[PDB]
Symmetry: D2
């Protein structure tokens, strides 16, 4: 076809990827419903979307939905280990520029993002951004400000990326408006919680094949990811302990039946080894970080962990674990891809039968995507139906074309209206075969809602 504008691991995997895409379409009714609803309208005609998000089968269905609605895209993954190579191949073989493979180096990861930004060595005529984690958003602001003049908006997938957007807005450096896709309930309380419930124990089993029942786990964090992670391990029969800095989230962990503990004596992290609860950490078989924070599994914790404990991170970035300390001081033995034994006996060489090692999964990167396939299609359906609606909304607002006085009034980080959140949810429920009841007019009046919704005030927490 003459198409060379891509870079994947193995284009010959395209047929396999296409078979899995066709299966995933049947698992994604909200996203496929949007394809059918908007195909004739072509609401993304003229949109040119820079996309940076895990190049999985689920992302493939998202891409082809955007394209079916009229958009053009240039795509990269937002993590070096999260691509499914057959997914990237199917997208490239469909004539869609994608630069992504499993097991990129840091230099290749940056090169891939740059290949979406540049076409034929010059800035692509981008006018929309879809991001997961804020890396593409950051590169555009620091390196390509002239490109942002013509971009109508950013739709950001995940908690960490939203935080970075809010920091830019606070400092007055955000250049285009954004939709916080993370905080739709059909994203945050579906993807972040239930997705990790499905995919955490999945990745741990694929990486180690360890029995989990009867063993001791420590989950650092009890937000949406930490809630789902803790359920992922508890439902397998693990004895799960939970750590938290937010006493409200800790209260939920208690009421949910977990013991709440701190790696530090009386919870005080003063940087000394004496502050580490060695008795507690010496009994832990598995530690999982879920925070989006820095260094919540630190060097002294790693030194105190029970021999042969598994260490992994399911937050967005690998700096939740002090893997730099481990690269500097301990010998790494690869078991298989994305599974390393870290030998605490020294830096130079190891004994093949040493018993004093840790098992690190995905080199500390997002373990569900690194060691398995991330969240399943039916969960990602909710997140990516929101993504498509967010893209439609900002592209139709046409921020880049507004006068400066109107731009100032629209430069914000917003969420989708609750009515749309509900409409995504209903398609998900129908996908399960669920039957929602319709309010009578008197019942709708009694609780103060329209029969068709929205059904809750914007303050409702679900």
């Amino acid at each position: 076809a003459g198409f060379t504008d891509y870079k994947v691991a193995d284009i010959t995997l395209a047929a396999w990827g296409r078979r899995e895409l066709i299966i995933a379409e049947s698992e994604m009714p909200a996203l496929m419903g949007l394809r059918r609803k908007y195909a004739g309208q072509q609401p993304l005609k003229g949109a040119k979307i820079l996309g940076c998000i895990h190049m999985t089968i689920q992302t493939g269905v998202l891409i082809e939905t955007l394209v079916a609605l009229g958009a053009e895209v240039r795509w990269s993954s937002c993590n070096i280990f999260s691509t499914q190579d057959q997914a990237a191949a199917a997208i490239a073989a469909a004539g869609i520029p994608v630069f992504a493979w499993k097991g990129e180096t840091e230099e290749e990861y940056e090169w891939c993002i740059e290949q979406t930004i540049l076409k034929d060595g010059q800035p692509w005529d981008a006018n929309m951004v879809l991001d997961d984690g804020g890396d593409l958003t950051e590169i555009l602001h620091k390196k390509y400000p002239q490109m942002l003049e013509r971009i109508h908006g950013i739709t950001e997938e995940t908690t960490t990326g939203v935080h970075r957007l809010l920091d830019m807005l606070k400092n007055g450096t955000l250049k285009v408006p954004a939709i916080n896709v993370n905080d739709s309930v059909t994203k945050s309380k579906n993807d972040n919680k239930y997705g990790c419930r499905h995919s955490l124990n999945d990745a741990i089993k694929r990486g180690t094949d360890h029995l989990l029942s009867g063993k001791q786990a420590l989950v650092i964090g009890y937000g949406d990811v930490g809630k789902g992670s803790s359920q992922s391990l508890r439902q397998e029969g693990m004895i799960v302990k939970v750590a938290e800095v937010d006493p409200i989230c800790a209260m939920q962990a208690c009421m949910d039946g977990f013991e709440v503990v701190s790696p530090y004596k009386n919870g005080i992290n003063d940087g000394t080894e004496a502050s580490i609860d060695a008795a507690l950490l010496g009994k832990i078989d598995l530690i999982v970080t879920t925070t989006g924070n820095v260094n919540v599994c630190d060097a002294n914790m790693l030194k105190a962990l029970k021999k042969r404990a598994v260490v992994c991170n399911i937050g967005h970035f690998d700096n939740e674990i002090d893997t730099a300390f481990m690269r500097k001081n301990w010998a790494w033995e690869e078991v298989k891809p994305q599974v390393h034994k870290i030998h605490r006996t020294g830096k130079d060489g190891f004994d093949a039968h040493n018993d004093d090692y840790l098992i690190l999964l995905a080199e500390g990167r997002l373990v569900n995507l690194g060691n398995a396939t991330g969240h399943p299609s039916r969960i990602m359906d909710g997140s990516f139906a929101n993504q498509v609606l967010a893209q439609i909304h900002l592209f139709e607002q046409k921020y880049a074309d507004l006068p400066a006085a109107e731009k100032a009034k629209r430069l914000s980080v917003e969420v989708l209206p609750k009515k749309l959140d509900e409409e995504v949810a209903l398609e998900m429920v129908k996908g399960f075969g669920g039957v929602v009841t319709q309010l009578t007019p008197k019942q709708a009046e009694y609780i103060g809602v329209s029969v068709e919704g929205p059904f809750k005030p914007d303050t409702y927490r679900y």
Copy 2:
């Protein structure tokens, strides 16, 4: 204790010593509430407060009452439900010299009389200046029947979802006369009391009323809000096969993901009024139906006619009109098994065969079943709710809304929630009561996620 004290009405004063024993146990189970008592007793922040209180007269409410008194308040108290009082709790409070008008098993006339006995003292309006309410009934009577009393009242602190809804409707219509705090929507209330409380107390009440095995049987929970979520878990953890109905697709999505089948009592979810719209095949398999919605007529007459023989029917929302019990009083014969447990014989109105097989079992005559057939939420859960109530009372009493000039009053006539910092401090005391240890952020960590080391840790938009 006070000599000659007669300003109360309870079922049995001889239960007071028993009630006091249970209050002393409950104090050990309520560290947030008792922490406020220790912290603020010397300051006496409620000195001069005269609180009208209307909330279920349980042992837990007793600990709330005596905390308010310990901080300087005078109170006059009634229950907000005819079946929810624990008579030993009411007796202990009356024996302490605190005016309380409450017993288990009031008539509706007695229920209204009890509220009016708090409102009046010696035949005339008490000089109340604060209101604590659970469901809005006391709020409604004051606005409807004693509007002049509201000229002296600084605020209302409302406990529960239904009460807040009524307050918001009044605010929208310009009929709310004093500011209010929505205690319900603290996270240490709504996502503790409403959910976890019902998880503890729903299966408790069904067991006490019926002693039915729940494992292996079929349940239908109407609603999947906070109460519906907790109720569904109460039954699923006993091994019930639980189906969930909802009108809200987001809540229905959560029910699916939580492992429940989502179904409607009506074919295709459409109630067209007729019996033909009822999914008779579904309802004929249900052993237990629980209403959790705060809405009206969500278990209606046609559903009751279609239910499986000998199914249990109950309501854990605030008001009994979730179930059309009036239809059942009109058409079917009631056989009392024991207090708050009735067999409802679908064979006819007049008599019943003592061995008739075609009956339903109704708990608490459709009133809040956890309080009607058991003791409601446990002390350690009510700790969170009632710590919020005390902080709410202190805040509004200190604001002195009734002493403001008319212009400044319109600026503060609002329904507010407590700030998140206080929500967190309540949660911290609850966690410590479990022996949990919260970790402290390092300065670099707190900078990294953009919070203070002391909190708050989440933006107000966070849903937990």
Copy 3:
């Protein structure tokens, strides 16, 4: 003019009858037997001494035995387990019953004796139904001439079966017995799932404590310990399990529980120093489930976290050293079957003392003492087995056999698997469950009959 009974309050009979009528609808296996055998009257001529918790469920059992032709004289096998409305309804029906909630030990003994004697002389009993062995022991020690005419004993529970097997081992057992406990529709229904239902039930009724998020220690992980551990874990407790049997301990681990010992390295040497004080100081609730003696001992009780709840769901109260607590500590009754035990001394207590334990049912069977025991639909299985066991031994007529034939039949046996399966089928039908029927080819393939039994006798389920 029926006076041959003693209950708390006969005016509770109408209430008891209402609850019996409900329970009948919850007990399809047992009522199925009532309907199937009523015309045949297989227990005509049976005269049954019965000793088992005088609950509503036992009421349905008694009236099934009577409906099948038997006469009975009844007592409870525990001082706190009677439901007074059940005893009243049975008495009001003209059935001799001696039972009330809150008996003294002297009254408990007197109640059993009133079943044994009628008009001051031995009743013409010829069958025994027992739960725990107390009636069986009194007959063997005190009324051997009565045992000469008794055809058999049907024994409900693990502890009573152990006592039977000891008698058989020693050559002191005088009549054959059926071990009803070890039907699968009893042991793996009643002992396990019944305790799942009623343990957290009784703890809530006695204390109204929140259980979610608190620390529990369950002593034992047999059938009762398995059901009890699930009762607490499903409420959200953090449950630790102790065991002496490493196979049961392995099951606890695989079921997601941490297995711990009250004693350092598991060595119970009798010293305070052997107590894992750090462990015991974390426990909010301890439950004993063993059928053994002193598995929650004085040194454990001294080390428990302040305000912990202590209770026992095994047959006898000696699982807990309550005698030590009576001797050393002050007891404050909260309400019936709930006591605070003040560890500050024996001579009085401060009403606001913080150093106390809460003891449920004075250490007696807590599900029956503080609630209503197992629910009717679970007891359906146990009591259908009891009825079938009574029929089997009564029809065998052991007492009428020659001495040489008695020696060949003096044993402790279980009911056959086909009966166990038929009880299970009625239970499943009560839930609306639909069992599949094997085709001839499938039955041939796995080597069973289409009607069962479906498993070899060695199968453990």
Copy 4:
């Protein structure tokens, strides 16, 4: 060394890394290595072994070798081998013939390669079997080899049934130990192993969300119990079918609805007997019975579009896959995952929506689409296997006089004391602490402080 056949010998280093890890996960098995290494109780044993050539089986093999045995090994299923485990064993100089993805013919050839060495019957004297295929081949094709064999140790429920049938028929030639019915096997492996590995295999094959979907589990024995839990703990709405009313009672009490694919449970052969409304709602069916044709052709026709079909019993005939080969078009998604298009036999529309997903072609799905049970669970089964091999080999049945052989030809289980000793090592691997009875407490309950703590009739 050339006496082996595996997929890729260069995987040996990888397999060896995973064996070193597995050793740390198998305390009972490694404890037997340490305690019997001095005695060498299997010196002189020549063991024919036929069981899934996994990493876990590699630790079993090297334990038998560490205690003195020679072995020749094959897998007992065409899809269960882990190629890196087989390579590590071959690279250790141990004859093994096994790879993932064998044909039926290759599977038989592999068993024959253990039986024969240099074109002649090996001088085998012990048999270790999982499912009875090797046992059957020896009896039917190499009966004279059985005159030198001291015993068989059989792993699984289906193989035990086959052994009992031969004993009843007078065709069993050597004594056997039923390893399945140790509690540390049956009530650990069969139940908890499937709890770990069923949802594992379904995720690896389909990556389907399981929460909120409907499952039908056929059977509720030990495998059906663990399978049902594997699905329910993920949030599936699980229904259970059973022919055994006692097992069905357990399913009800465990919180499951008990249903039959057939109206009133009567499987009369007609489409009319199928409960089409029930089957049309099922997203996943799992067979666990060890029986034949429990997911039959009419059920397959009635299933909800895009339902997943799989089998975790020993043999693939639980599902009528022959019917589907005969009538419907198979589209391979990836190895051991096939879409079966119900539109017809010859060809399919790539976008057809009327298909079912079959995992592992109906073969044991946990080993076919994942890695079977985890090391810490297989520890219990394989410690029992080692002990049973030691017992039968030391009994030396083949060397006994005829009348002594008649008294010794039986199928037995290991004593409870050994069962408990395996369990103790497993418990210690979790860090659990077993309490020791006092002498008074032991006397009170009528046991020895040493145990056994339960009568042989106890069901746990």
